[PDB]
Amino acid sequence: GLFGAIAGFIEGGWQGMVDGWYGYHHSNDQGSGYAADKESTQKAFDGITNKVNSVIEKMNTQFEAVGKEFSNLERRLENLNKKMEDGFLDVWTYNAELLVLMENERTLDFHDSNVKNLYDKVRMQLRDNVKELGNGCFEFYHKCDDECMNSVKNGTYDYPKYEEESKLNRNE
Amino acid sequence: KVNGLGSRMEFSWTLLDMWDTINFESTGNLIAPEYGFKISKRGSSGIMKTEGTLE
Numbered sequence: 001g002l003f004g005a006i007a008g009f010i011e012g013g014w015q016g017m018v019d020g021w022y023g024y025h026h027s028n029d030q031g032s033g034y035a036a037d038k039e040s041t042q043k044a045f046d047g048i049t050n051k052v053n054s055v056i057e058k059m060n061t062q063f064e065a066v067g068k069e070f071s072n073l074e075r076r077l078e079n080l081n082k083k084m085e086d087g088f089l090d091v092w093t094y095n096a097e098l099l100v101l102m103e104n105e106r107t108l109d110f111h112d113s114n115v116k117n118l119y120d121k122v123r124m125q126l127r128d129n130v131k132e133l134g135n136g137c138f139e140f141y142h143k144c145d146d147e148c149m150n151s152v153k154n155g156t157y158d159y160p161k162y163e164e165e166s167k168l169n170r171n172e
Numbered sequence: 173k174v175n176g177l178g179s180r181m182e183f184s185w186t187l188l189d190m191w192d193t194i195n196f197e198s199t200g201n202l203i204a205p206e207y208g209f210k211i212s213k214r215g216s217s218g219i220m221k222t223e224g225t226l227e
């Protein structure tokens with residue numbers, strides 16, 4: 001999209017992840033599998049629900065009674081009432097449709113930004129210990145495990161631990 | 173002729189305020205009310221044509 005993640009350098013989506021909106025896929029010696037990112041997903045969910053609550057709850061109520069109420073003695077006042085009804089109809093139709101379009105564009109871009117941001121958060125942490133594959137994956141220049149993967153996911157990853165091993169395997 | 177008659181009956185109405193008197197006076201042709209209607213309004217509404225079933 002706008003941030004080039006969804007349908008971008010990350011081609012497809014993951015059917016296997018029912019846990020959340022954005023998550024990880026790890027593939028190591030122990031075993032592969034998916035896992036969500038609760039923080040980013042819940043933040044998005046809170047914002048999105050706050051969005052649809054905004055376009056719904058901010059609408060004014062106003063009890064009114066739409067009808068003819070004007071006889072054939074007064075066809076000018078009928079026409080006046082008709083101009084008014086249609087005038088608002090044209091206003092609300094046009095405004096509502098464009099609102100939905102613009103808001104949907106923003107929403108999709110919003111999701112894109114979220115995935116991209118998670119990608120950057122990860123890459124910024126891993127640095128040159130991994131080979132950036134460009135498809136959304138990182139191939140480790142060392143041997144990571146389930147104990148190391150969780151360290152990446154939870155925000156505490158030890159770069160200098162794997163620095164020298166990664167360097168040697170990098171210039172291999 | 174409408175319903176056989178060439179004659180007509182033209183009706184008018186009014187809202188008589190509280191503690192106020194109304195005065196009918198006629199030498200002929202008057203069609204008098206036997207009843208009045210007490211009324212109150214918090215607001216107005218409309219009239220709907222449906223043809224069927226209040227539920």
Ligand SMILES: *[C@@H]1O[C@H](CO)[C@@H](O[C@@H]2O[C@H](CO)[C@@H](O)[C@H](O)[C@H]2NC(C)=O)[C@H](O)[C@H]1NC(C)=O
Pocket residue numbers: 191192193
């Ligand atoms: C219509 O009836 C009302 C009472 O239902 C009359 O109002 C009262 O008139 C008496 C006599 O002067 C007063 O003492 C009261 O103070 C009035 N009551 C009210 C409404 O405050 C009224 O006079 C009658 N109208 C007439 C003259 O036919």
